[PDB]
Amino acid sequence: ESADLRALAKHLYDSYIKSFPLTKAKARAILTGKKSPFVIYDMNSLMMGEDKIKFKHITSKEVAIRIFQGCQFRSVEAVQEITEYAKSIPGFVNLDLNDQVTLLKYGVHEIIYTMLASLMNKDGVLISEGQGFMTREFLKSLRKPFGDFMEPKFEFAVKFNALELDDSDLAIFIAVIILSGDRPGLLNVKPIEDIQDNLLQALELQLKLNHPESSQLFAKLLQKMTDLRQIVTEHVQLLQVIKKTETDMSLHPLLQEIYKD
Amino acid sequence: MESADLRALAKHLYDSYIKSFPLTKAKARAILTGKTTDKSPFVIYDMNSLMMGEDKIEVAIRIFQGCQFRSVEAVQEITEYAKSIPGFVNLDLNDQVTLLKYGVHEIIYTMLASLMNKDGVLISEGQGFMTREFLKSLRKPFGDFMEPKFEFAVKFNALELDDSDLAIFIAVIILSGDRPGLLNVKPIEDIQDNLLQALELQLKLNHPESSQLFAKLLQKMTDLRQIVTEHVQLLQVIKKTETDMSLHPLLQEIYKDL
Ligand SMILES: O=C(O)c1ccc(-c2nn(C(=O)c3c(Cl)cccc3C(F)(F)F)c3ccc(Cl)cc23)c(COc2ccccc2)c1
Ligand SMILES: O=C(O)c1ccc(-c2nn(C(=O)c3c(Cl)cccc3C(F)(F)F)c3ccc(Cl)cc23)c(COc2ccccc2)c1
């Protein structure tokens, strides 16, 4: 069944490429300088970037709020991308429909954090399919709670990126996260855990072949699912604090509805 | 890195686990499943049977303090076991402290599952058995403090690990190079890579029909991390309400800036 695992890995890589706008391979070429992106490093360069490259989400007038809400809009776009990618995982659409919804609901936060790391280095993050680059210092320095909201994302990403995964690795990893049989409220866990066992086999084999000198990388990548669960939990608690504290974050009620999750 | 060397490391760790922990999963299962007249526990299911149990072997505080005493004992045993893990005592001393500070609680929960089934937990080296329902029914926050341990244990026990498995698994948890404040992560990760290699081979040989148990067991390190956090948060709440309990200095230090 070795060749079947390679097939599953090839299938997932191909679908991963079509589903997501900016791959890790392309992002690394931009970050390293190998078409130069617009750099956002302060207030004035932000004002020119939306006026020049036209970042879609520009509708509050405060800077830190607008950036945070920009992160919200992009995450909503990513949810739809992850949802399309999930449909291509062998077995997923044959699951009970409520269970498909449940796996996506509880998994998107972990996948967004994972995939965001592909767009970051220690100095900033790519935005708008790589045309912009927002510096870590500028984000880290936003006022009151917003500065401390951005920086944990970078600290996770730098640690995660030290594993040096490529897109073919990440496609199987993302699928493994989706097929988590321990999400609350699953109706039929058995076929989810069955698919995950296939995906885990595919990830293990892929990592031995693609990183043969990287001892126990499979184990180390699974240990990063501990980090993911913990930071997703910390993330939710920070959103709750931001909602309860800030009143200058009223949006149109229909816009609030799009962002409900 | 060679197969026979991994088997040697598994046997070393299993042997040391036996010397360090007096109540094994093997012994606990023999008591729990029964059919033995000689190993049969006294069952504590209410207030009066608790009163009879002390003659044989406030309530919620007394039980909570009993868990504190046992946890201190567990730390001592876990610490003795850690010293036997090849390479651990050769590490920088501050890192040795750090690995223990962050590892002991995750290990206590792991080994506590060995003493539980869905209906209760063995106590006092297997001589007693306290029902889950009784613990769940303790007053104010103490009732809910006991129960999350049970929820993990039922899931964890479904993996059907035995002691030779748990010996390597416990060592892997201790040698975690991602603990906060470690000074030299590289020598810790090198040891874990051997321990991880040892666990993988051990699970393959001992559970050949249990597909991807290695991966599923590592995913359980996630459930451990979450319940330690929920535990620490519950203690902080109990402290602000109760002064009628101090904590043992060993436990006091483990929680400092955890
Ligand atoms: O392109 C992508 O793949 C992409 C994916 C994730 C993020 C992003 N999400 N995010 C979260 O807080 C967040 C997370 Cl991690 C998980 C779930 C929900 C949230 C939510 F809802 F609360 F936002 C961030 C926090 C800090 C930073 Cl530096 C980045 C993000 C981004 C940024 O996009 C921007 C676009 C324009 C201007 C500024 C940022 C891109
Ligand atoms: O034998 C063992 O290895 C063994 C190991 C852990 C526990 C135990 N600790 N514990 C904690 O709350 C606790 C924890 Cl997990 C970690 C650090 C500090 C605490 C603290 F501070 F609060 F005490 C529990 C809560 C609920 C239950 Cl069901 C069990 C325990 C037990 C119980 O032992 C008993 C002995 C006599 C009477 C009743 C119970 C045994």
Swiss-Prot record, chain B:
Effect recorded for residue 68 to P: In colon cancer; sporadic; somatic mutation; loss of ligand-binding
One BP annotation, GO: negative regulation of receptor signaling pathway via STAT
Expression induction: (Microbial infection) Expression increases when incubated with M.tuberculosis or its lipoprotein LpqH; induction is TLR2-dependent (at protein level).
Domain of life, per lineage: Eukaryota
Regulation: PDPK1 activates its transcriptional activity independently of its kinase activity.
UniProt: rosiglitazone binding residues: 68-71, 105, 231, 255
Free-text domain note: The 9aaTAD motif is a transactivation domain present in a large number of yeast and animal transcription factors.
This protein's name: Peroxisome proliferator-activated receptor gamma
Highest classification ranks of the organism: Eukaryota, Metazoa, Chordata, Craniata, Vertebrata
